């Protein structure tokens, strides 16, 4: 067999990677952070409650102004919230109600949404006609859209359930770069602060560092054991966290190319649905299937806080660009600021 | 002064909540349905490229919204969680190379025992009983070789067959129903109930069956709000 003689080099390269990563594994993140001061109990209280949505809220994204946030709910509504005054700025009716992701552009002028329709709908929030209308529909994806993030006003990276991530040009409406590395449904992507590389977590228990401009997969992180449903870059741009169904969060590194930390607990046997760092990356706020969030210590790996004010599964959470608020969307149609 | 832009914002929220209130009426009145087949189960004929096919139909002034996942891959473990808030999952079974019936039994097993589908009832539609009608009465054993417990199985005496229907198909027709019920009577827990039917992709009451079955789901959901059942 020739294909079996082709996997001879693949497993030899895998064992070479498993041995190359062993040389860099001279210590552990707990070994370097064993003497640091623990952050103690991080207790956050619900400051706002966005109860405008009807169905379960699947996704949410903060604006770079740290005040306006957009949320996606399975009822077909993309509501832009003024987190300071709880006043709904917009109520975008979606063509397809089964939206699984929404992205707030850094410019604040555009917003996105995607889901089972396999189409990313870019809505212009600055319209002189009087209504928020579809600016461009991206129907190139062959699977459901699980995550999408804005690079520019005309660039947006949308991951999809077809094991493929894609880079889009909103003007032409065509894929400029297609990432076909993952073997499972890509559930979440996360852009780096430089917006030149992004990591995508898929159902293959592996996370891949994708170069946006070159279109190649730089590194692959398969430290997890189940479907990676969540991913979030570290604020420095060199690391990222991954939430999977194995009830474990794992902090990888783009330079060590291996798992640096594992956030696990015997009380937690439920999959993670969303992860997020703080402005300093010290706290790892992760959404769980326990109907509540957990404030993990990225350096100590010990749980430092719990956000238990959600009735149903916390499907999404997000931390502002200034680290002042933490919105946590859940399946109970309620967003809450922590 | 900035209070002139806040009063325009609080009055914009007034228009939004009025739209959300008017949209809350059409959302709760409309019953979302998931038409999920088992491959070549004939789910296309029950309705009579895109990521999902939204189908609209009303029965007795009650609007239903059936959703058929068209361009979705066979890996359903992720996008099936989006259908937690649906009234029912229309499970279409071929009922007749690969053992498609066992694949439907394993798909129904994963759907029934899914932690996010514990409250979602399933309207089981054993479709294509016309094709099954000649697979049992003309030799060509496809239910006995694929299920050895079918030999030691008799038609229930209380079962009601169709007028002019041989017991050989009725035994196989109800054995397929009993195979899916062995999963329902195990993980029911008084939260969701399976509603098996014998559809043929040629009937005219399949939509009426969903209407009558969705009536029991909403009834049993309201019966549990008062802690009656």
């Amino acid at each position, epitope marked *: 067999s020739e294909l079996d003689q082709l996997r001879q080099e693949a497993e030899q390269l895998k064992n070479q990677i498993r041995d190359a990563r062993k040389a860099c594994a001279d210590a552990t993140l707990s070994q370097i952070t064993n003497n640091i001061d623990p952050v103690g109990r991080i207790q956050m209280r619900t400051r706002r409650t966005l109860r405008g949505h009807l169905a379960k809220i699947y996704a949410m994204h903060w604006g770079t102004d740290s005040r306006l946030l957009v949320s996606a709910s399975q009822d077909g509504k993309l509501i832009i919230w003024d987190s300071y005054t709880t006043n709904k700025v917009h109520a975008i009716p979606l063509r397809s109600s089964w939206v699984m992701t929404c992205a707030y552009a850094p410019s604040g002028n555009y917003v996105a949404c995607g889901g089972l329709d396999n189409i990313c709908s870019i809505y212009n929030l600055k319209t002189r006609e009087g209504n928020v209308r579809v600016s461009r529909e991206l129907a190139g994806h062959t699977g459901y859209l699980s995550c999408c993030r804005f690079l520019d006003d005309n660039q947006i990276v949308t991951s999809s359930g077809d094991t493929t991530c894609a880079l889009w040009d909103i003007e032409t409406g065509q894929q400029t770069t297609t990432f076909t590395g993952h073997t499972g449904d890509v559930m979440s992507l996360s852009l780096a602060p430089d917006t030149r590389l992004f990591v995508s977590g898929a159902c293959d228990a592996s996370a891949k560092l994708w170069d946006v401009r070159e279109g190649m997969c730089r590194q692959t992180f398969t430290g997890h054991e189940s479907d990676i449903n969540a991913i979030c870059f570290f604020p420095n741009g060199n690391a990222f966290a991954t939430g999977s169904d194995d009830a474990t969060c794992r902090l990888f590194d783009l330079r060590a190319d291996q798992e640096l930390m594992t956030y696990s607990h015997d009380n937690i046997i439920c999959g993670i649905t969303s992860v997020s760092f703080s402005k300093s990356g010290r706290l790892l706020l992760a959404g769980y299937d326990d109907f509540n969030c957990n404030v993990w210590d990225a350096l100590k790996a010990d749980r430092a806080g719990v956000l238990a004010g959600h009735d149903n599964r916390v499907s999404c959470l997000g931390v502002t660009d200034d680290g002042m608020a933490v919105a946590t969307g859940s399946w109970d149609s309620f967003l809450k600021i922590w | 002064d900035q209070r002139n832009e806040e009063k325009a914002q609080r009055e914009a929220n007034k228009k939004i909540e009025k739209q959300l209130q008017k949209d809350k009426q059409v959302y709760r009145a409309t019953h979302r349905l998931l038409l999920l087949g088992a491959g070549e189960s004939g789910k296309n004929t029950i309705v009579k490229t895109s990521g999902i096919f939204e189908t609209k139909f009303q029965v007795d002034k009650v609007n239903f919204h059936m959703f058929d996942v068209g361009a979705q891959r066979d890996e359903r473990r992720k996008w099936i969680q989006c259908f937690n808030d649906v009234t029912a999952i229309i499970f279409v079974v071929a009922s007749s*190379q690969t053992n498609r019936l066992q694949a439907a039994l394993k798909l129904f097993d*994963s759907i029934w025992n899914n932690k996010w589908l514990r409250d979602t009832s399933v309207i089981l539609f054993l479709n294509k009983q016309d094709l099954l009608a000649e697979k049992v009465l003309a030799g060509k054993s496809k239910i006995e070789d694929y299920f050895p417990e079918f030999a030691r199985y008799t038609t229930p005496e209380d079962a009601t067959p169709e007028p002019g229907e041989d017991p050989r198909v009725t035994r196989a027709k109800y054995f397929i129903r009993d195979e899916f019920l062995r999963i329902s009577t195990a993980s029911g827990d008084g939260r969701h109930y399976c509603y098996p039917h014998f559809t043929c992709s040629v009937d005219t009451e399949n939509i009426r069956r969903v209407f009558n079955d969705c009536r029991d789901i909403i009834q049993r959901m309201h019966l549990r709000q008062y802690e009656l059942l």
Partner: nanobody
Amino acid sequence: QVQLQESGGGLVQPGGSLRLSCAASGFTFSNYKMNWVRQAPGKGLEWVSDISQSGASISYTGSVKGRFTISRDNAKNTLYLQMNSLKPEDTAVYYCARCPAPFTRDCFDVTSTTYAYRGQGTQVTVS
């Protein structure tokens, strides 16, 4: 990395026997339901047998209800498929497919064409 390297297999005379091992490495055993799926030449991926994370719950497909016997050793992180009375219908690449999520009663996509928690497969031929 979830590594499901299966052992055993080969050409066996009809009415024989075969033991299929599955070295389940890279993940925490005894937490995931272990399944067995095959792919006959010219057919799609079908489910053969599964087993719970504790070994109590055991299921087989109809054709191998009494002939095959699944087994797992949580200590050795291995999965066994004691196949007996092999027929010319059992010639297929048997795959050791793990359940995607742990501590669940639901096992999805074990028979999908593309699945990352499925072993490389053992070419079991019955001739």
